[PDB]
Symmetry: none
Subunit: 197 residues, 2 copies
């Protein structure tokens, strides 16, 4: 079994990439993919509260997300990891550090603390990072379609930039400035390289 | 009247904390900025970005790219600020590459020195703070065998380096609060004199 997570900002191609990588791997591996909280009712119901949040406090927001993450972990991720499966997750801990910790201003380590509580020391065996630059990212978001969104997005990236330093044991970065056909392949090779050895 | 101040140390030495506390104490009275290579510089970014997406990339290539991204950072951000007469607080510099790449990764200190002497073109810190942390104190502030022995190699490589015109060592084995304060005193004593 293997717990492999994907992480990336707006415009990193994260959705499409993961879906496409996933259907390739299924050919050859006992592998599933899940979108946190992955239809788990308590996780989904918890999260409903943040989405329905009316200018809600970010720490309230981060705690509910961590709780929602945990429900999904314990009711879906762990049971499938226990039946030998490979498990792919659209987001996980490192997302929270980048959005809540660095971008929103709570504190990387405070949010890491929160998250260590929620996940009981279940770190991913491998994390894929979709390294997209602020400029290409911006261009993806515009392409598929104020000054707030932009600098905030530039901040998200910045935080992903810090997190990933000194965590190379589990991180591998793919180029997400490449056409999506190439982001897929490099990601798929990263994952299978990991599984083979 | 302008100061190029660098901060060296291994991970676990408090560096991150110390540089920020001290930034915040010095903004009151000095035209200070806070930077870490590649510090937002585009060319600098681009170069670094290639090493990241490296798959088992040669270590010397990696080191050259590290120097190029450094010299972009230095010439496009550090040098212009020194000229407007700023205090630039810099997180990692020449001595970082030596310990990590010269000593810890086995390339050779003199070979990394010579390459870093090319990238900075004789532009050294006016003052370099070394947060001197033991390995065992380092280890604990951090949390496998590879990383513990790599960490120890980094520290060992610094100990070789530091052996004093620009170097001052804060004892990083103190609580972080005291490492911050001694670092400050050490810096204000440089700027006020």
């Amino acid at each position: 079994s293997a717990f492999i997570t994907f992480e990336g900002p707006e415009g990193s191609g994260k959705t499409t990439v993961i879906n496409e990588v996933y259907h390739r791997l299924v050919k050859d591996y006992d592998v599933i993919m899940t979108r946190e909280p992955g239809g788990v009712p308590t996780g989904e119901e918890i999260r409903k509260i943040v989405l329905e949040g009316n200018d809600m406090d970010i720490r309230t927001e981060a705690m509910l997300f961590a709780a929602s993450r945990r429900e999904h972990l314990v009711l879906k991720v762990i049971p499938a990891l226990k039946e030998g499966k490979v498990v792919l997750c659209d987001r996980y801990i490192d997302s929270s550090l980048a959005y809540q910790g660095y971008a929103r201003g709570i504190g990387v380590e405070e949010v890491r603390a929160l998250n260590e509580f929620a996940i009981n020391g279940l770190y991913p065996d491998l994390t894929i990072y979709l390294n997209v630059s602020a400029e290409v990212g911006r261009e993806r978001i515009i392409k598929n379609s104020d000054q707030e969104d932009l600098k905030f997005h530039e901040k998200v990236i910045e935080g992903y930039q810090e997190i990933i330093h000194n965590e190379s044991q589990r991180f591998k970065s793919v180029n997400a400035d490449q056409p999506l056909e190439n982001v897929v392949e490099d990601t798929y090779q990263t994952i299978i390289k990991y599984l083979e050895k």
